[PDB]
Symmetry: D2
């Protein structure tokens, strides 16, 4: 044991970013983010022995500004975009959900940090307009799951890679390289306590998973109620995850910039699909930083089956 | 930096003192905690570089070494393990060393479940000493390997929750005399089995989604890991169900080391635990690996479901 | 991933079983290990963001809570602590909770030293029960907080060394029945006290540097922390000295909780421990904070120095 | 607790290196080195539960080459300088002692990693000649002490800073900023088992510390027998550390490039002095990568007192 050739997230992003002639900024940005992720992981691991959304928020803003790689930051927590001080500005726009579903801590349900990184393209002064790009423009996106293990999943133009935090050295080690989702899965994930408010396409799809017409075995249902936990299971095991709109949350619950679009970019770089039920989530041009969206994502055939049922109903 | 920390060892030692006992339960839970920490560290790095097997070996070894056990029943072993005379003590332990190990690929929280009986007869230790009603467990609980490692322990005196402090390797008392909510707002079941359900489960699920008294509908959650789902049911209230579907008409979950521990914890917290026909804890087992249907959780929610079972007679 | 790990708790429990005892020594060293891990974590981050005090409070609390002690003697406390009747057990423990705490500024390895006696009288617990010859300790040792945390434990059966595995928070048996080398090649003393030495220490130091039989000279090492210097003397052999200099003419180090533990460990490993006039362990103490001169280490090296003390009469 | 504004070694070197318009290479180099330091720290912390000089060596070479910041590496272990593959070359020369005094592990004596970093100045092809610069040219030097805590001490042109590894997050936190050694100390550190072979200046100096002519209190002696442990005590507490030549190790024992010169640069940036007894260690132009040297270092007045005794004797 004592491996002499550790592949850390920093080393990985460097061996790619160097083959691309990049300015070192991305490595710094993500190395910073990793420091915040280990700090939150440790706090969550001791939380009952020991508001954490708020402390997590502050920590992520402070390591991102000190990376000297960012210029506009968008949080769930902060009402308006944070524009970084000129001395510390670099060229990226980061949109992040710092501690997704923090009420789930009480029940020890695995929660996560979700992030999306854009490059600032304009010549003008950093404003929140720099944050209003469609998901399609993301240069990197991902999440950190704080579970039985801490996994950082990073998607960049070349594919999805998983890194697991080795607790003894405080480093994310590359554990799965260029991940791809199954074509067709066997689990559907949706909160069925909203049955009453679902649209017809949704309702027909669930019945087809439970009562397969085709008289195969019905799908298994799974719903942790933590988006990072449910998307991680959908990525490694396959299947479909659905948070559509239901009358009483008419534009969906999840936020387009820092929950839906990071997950949709990961899904797509893994060979999966992500849609509202009408358009692809990554093509939506955002008009508000806290804009909400329906999302259905997962294995290509499963999503395509629900898209055909949506087509049928309009 | 807190100087009078209550650890699981201090806690169990002071309760045992009141029994005017031998010290054997404290030796036992002390050893079990060593195994729990080692499985926790293993799951935390399961990826960097099967586990159910090592977990099984580890729990058996630390328990044989405690000088507190005489019969051991594992999910992994066809027959009960009888402890060597020189290491025998008075307890029978039935445990599931790493429930739903397949779940580790997806980072789903899993855990160790255990039930401890006292051997009461004078003849040689055997499987029959483990074939007691769950109502006769002297202690039970589970360790959850999740974003934090938690050990929940129920004994005659209540349910207490201990969190592993990873900096000093000790389980610290963080929650005392846990009691479940009387009525919750979450139902937990694998609805992919919908065609396989019976009339009462099906009518109950339906009235959760479409509430007759025009109430708020229940939220649904189903992690797919018994320890995670039951832990949320304990701290948040609600109902968790794994009834008989026709592919598992006795139920899926095993009575001695999955259903009975969890049911003993639920009833100690003021919750209820039923098959839909009898109390889980009052079933008299005939095979150490027999399965049972389970419905457990907040009292009003489980009663409601029991009233749909009997309004269906 | 090793499934039958020998922890200090398993080790002490199986030896105690042979005594047909009460289980009290195991309760005691189990609690002391909880305190040792917490002091270890504290020293490892002493810088990020006094400690002798918290260390002292922590050792007293875990010991009062073990139900195994009745008198406690600390470096930090003017008088012996008598344990409350409801928590009293049979042992007297004298300990130094964080020896040479000033050394932490320089990252010098420091440690906890302890000696355990059995209270033998029938009258109420008092300081007099701690005023026994070191020869009558039933167990002694130290925990070194260094690049690794090590607990060295000596009891009637030998010296064993246990290393803290920081991933599972358990002390693992890594070295069994440690015996010192008969003759070593390192002498350890604070030579800045050179004018204060006596004739025999001065002639001995001189013959280490300029060996009369034209031998190899000894290496000198002096960490300035009793636990580090004595630990190197145990694993590597040699001699360690803190004789009386005229500013400390009784010696500096305290008999009950620094000299006697270390001397009991040395004699159990086959080493010797002297003041230069008597065996340290046979001194009958009159004050719980009295000091003594100490010279301990490999048998041939300590004898040689004893022959320069008597060739000086 | 849970501090939201953690100052890590990476953040520190970045906030300096950015004010200097540097290429990001130094941050990468030292971030790499920190990964190797945490890995060795953890191995040493479990060594008895569990050649490590050799494994440590390999790990340090592999993280340095992957930093894309180095071109020539010099180790105690390897006979000749390691020239890095063109794809991975950057501009620094690193000379390192990977696990100083590894025999001291058996006795749990604190040992360390020592490093010196030069910039390659030549226009020619990386060779070991790039490593043969006098200590005066070092752009950064330092050490990692694996003790009761792991401390990384880093000296750069601006001063000496201490960082302590926080074990829970795997990060070196800045704990002492712009450190300076005491002018005059009260401890002298030398292996006096060599008394017989010392030169007259040394011998006179030790007697003056034990039998102060001036009839003050004699100095205290301390000698751990681990250079990193003894230099760290000399830096924080003051005093003098001496490893001169004694007949049977006639050019000193310690190596000029990766033991003496990193320590001499730290001492001097802390306001201390480091000398052979004849010249300043940092002005010696090395001719062999494994060249040995006398070194006496510590508080300015203490070293100056021994230098005057050396002057007297020639
Ligand atoms: O209770 P609901 O409405 O099903 O919410 C679940 C969703 O809410 C969150 O907890 C926060 O958005 C997500 O992690 C998850 O996908
Ligand atoms: O020390 P003993 O003999 O094992 O007795 C402990 C008994 O006390 C309890 O801890 C509660 O009084 C029980 O769980 C157990 O049966
Ligand atoms: O996939 P299913 O059929 O819903 O079963 C999940 C159940 O099985 C297990 O994975 C193993 O018993 C449990 O942890 C869990 O409650
Ligand atoms: O369990 P008890 O009564 O405390 O006895 C333990 C005794 O056994 C030993 O561990 C060795 O036989 C002693 O150190 C101690 O006095
Ligand atoms: O500075 P001195 O006088 O050599 O004393 C060092 C001794 O004092 C202590 O620091 C405290 O007793 C010991 O650890 C050590 O052996
Ligand atoms: O035994 P000696 O000759 O005093 O050697 C001590 C020196 O050797 C080393 O162990 C290795 O060079 C150093 O850490 C230390 O300064």
């Amino acid at each position: 044991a004592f491996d002499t050739n550790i592949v850390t997230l920093t080393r990985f992003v460097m061996e790619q970013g160097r083959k691309a002639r990049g300015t070192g900024e991305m490595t710094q940005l993500l190395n910073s983010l990793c420091t915040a992720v280990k700090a939150i992981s440790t706090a969550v691991r001791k939380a009952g022995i020991a508001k954490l959304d708020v402390l997590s928020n502050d920590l992520v803003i402070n390591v991102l500004k000190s990376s000297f790689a960012t210029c506009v930051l968008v949080t769930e927590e902060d009402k308006n975009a944070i524009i970084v001080e000129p001395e510390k500005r670099g060229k990226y726009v980061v949109c992040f959900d710092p501690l997704d579903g923090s009420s789930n801590i009480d029940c020890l349900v695995s929660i996560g940090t979700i992030f999306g990184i854009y490059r600032k393209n304009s010549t003008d002064e950093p404003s929140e307009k720099d944050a209003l790009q469609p998901g399609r423009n993301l240069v990197a996106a991902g999440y950190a799951l704080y579970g039985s293990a801490t996994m950082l999943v990073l998607a960049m133009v070349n594919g999805v890679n998983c890194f697991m935090l080795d607790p003894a050295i405080g480093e994310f080690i590359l554990v799965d390289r260029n991940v791809k989702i199954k074509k067709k899965g066997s689990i559907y994930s949706i909160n069925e306590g909203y049955a009453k408010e679902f649209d017809p396409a949704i309702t027909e799809y669930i019945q087809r998973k439970k009562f397969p017409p085709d008289n195969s075995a019905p799908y298994g249902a799974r719903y942790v109620g933590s988006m990072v936990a449910d998307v991680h299971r959908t990525l490694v095991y396959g299947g479909i995850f659905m948070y559509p709109a239901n009358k009483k949350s008419p534009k969906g619950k999840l936020r387009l910039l820092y929950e839906c679009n990071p997950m949709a970019y990961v899904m797509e770089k893994a060979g999966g699909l992500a849609t509202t039920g009408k358009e692809a989530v990554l093509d939506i041009v955002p008009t508000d930083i806290h804009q909400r969206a329906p999302i259905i994502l997962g294995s290509p055939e499963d999503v395509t089956e629900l898209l055909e049922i949506y087509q049928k109903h309009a």
